[PDB]
Symmetry: C3
Subunit: 107 residues, 3 copies
């Protein structure tokens, strides 16, 4: 199963990286005075959510979880100015994500 790989290798790699903490839970727009955030981002997403979806049999298959990881990154690129701290962090994780996703087994 590919879902096992995503939970046991991909997610675990990403979650232990030093740059993970901003994406381990939803962006708290309230704490940060961002009333624009949830208006600009209509599908918010995080490794918080992806984790619990993997642990609670939410996905139809692996490719829906992959779509969630892409959304999480692109959300970050949509809201934030290019080349900010936070954007570079997303890119480091996205590069690491694409590497890990190539070794994905088949069935």
């Amino acid at each position: 199963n590919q879902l096992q790989y995503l939970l046991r290798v991909v997610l675990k790699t990403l979650w232990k990286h030093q740059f993970a903490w901003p994406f381990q839970q939803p962006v708290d727009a309230v704490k940060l005075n961002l009333p624009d955030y949830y208006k600009i981002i209509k599908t918010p997403m995080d490794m918080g959510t992806i984790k619990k979806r993997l642990e609670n049999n939410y996905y139809w298959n692996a490719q829906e979880c992959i779509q969630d990881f892409n959304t999480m990154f692109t959300n970050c690129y949509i809201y934030n100015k290019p080349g900010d701290d936070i954007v570079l962090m997303a890119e480091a994780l996205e590069k690491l994500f694409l590497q890990k996703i190539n070794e994905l087994p088949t069935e």
Copy 2:
């Protein structure tokens, strides 16, 4: 073509039922203490609620779809036993039972 039944019970059936206006009585167990109904757990031997059915889908409890379906049936039939026809609680259960039966008819193969 290749769809799992339990997935569908989760992503489609439970999800539809959960959002519906009349869903809240059934989203957690019936609280005997809060209502002072010390007879509920005597009369209703196997209690059940969408909240439990949800944890069971989320945590690999059920053996097959039949078993999840039966807990649905049980929740409704429990409610119909304990409360007497005409009550709002029963009408609400009757609405969700109908809808359940539609969504069950679309189930994978």
Copy 3:
């Protein structure tokens, strides 16, 4: 039927209800018990609590990785504590039972 479902619904359920389970239903709180050495001696703590959260969220690659955890829990107990101790006899009762139930494992 499936081997992971068996472990969850039969093996764990039986072991969980049993009277000697309570010390193995959560980690060994080395803080509460003033046991500085426990996490130096026992390099992989394990307990039925953690196994359950593992079976319920989708941790295990296969049934054997669940079984190695059950065996770890028992041997961790046999290592840390002295033979004869109450806690050991409890684990021995649970081992006997665990093994009985594993002989009925599905094909």
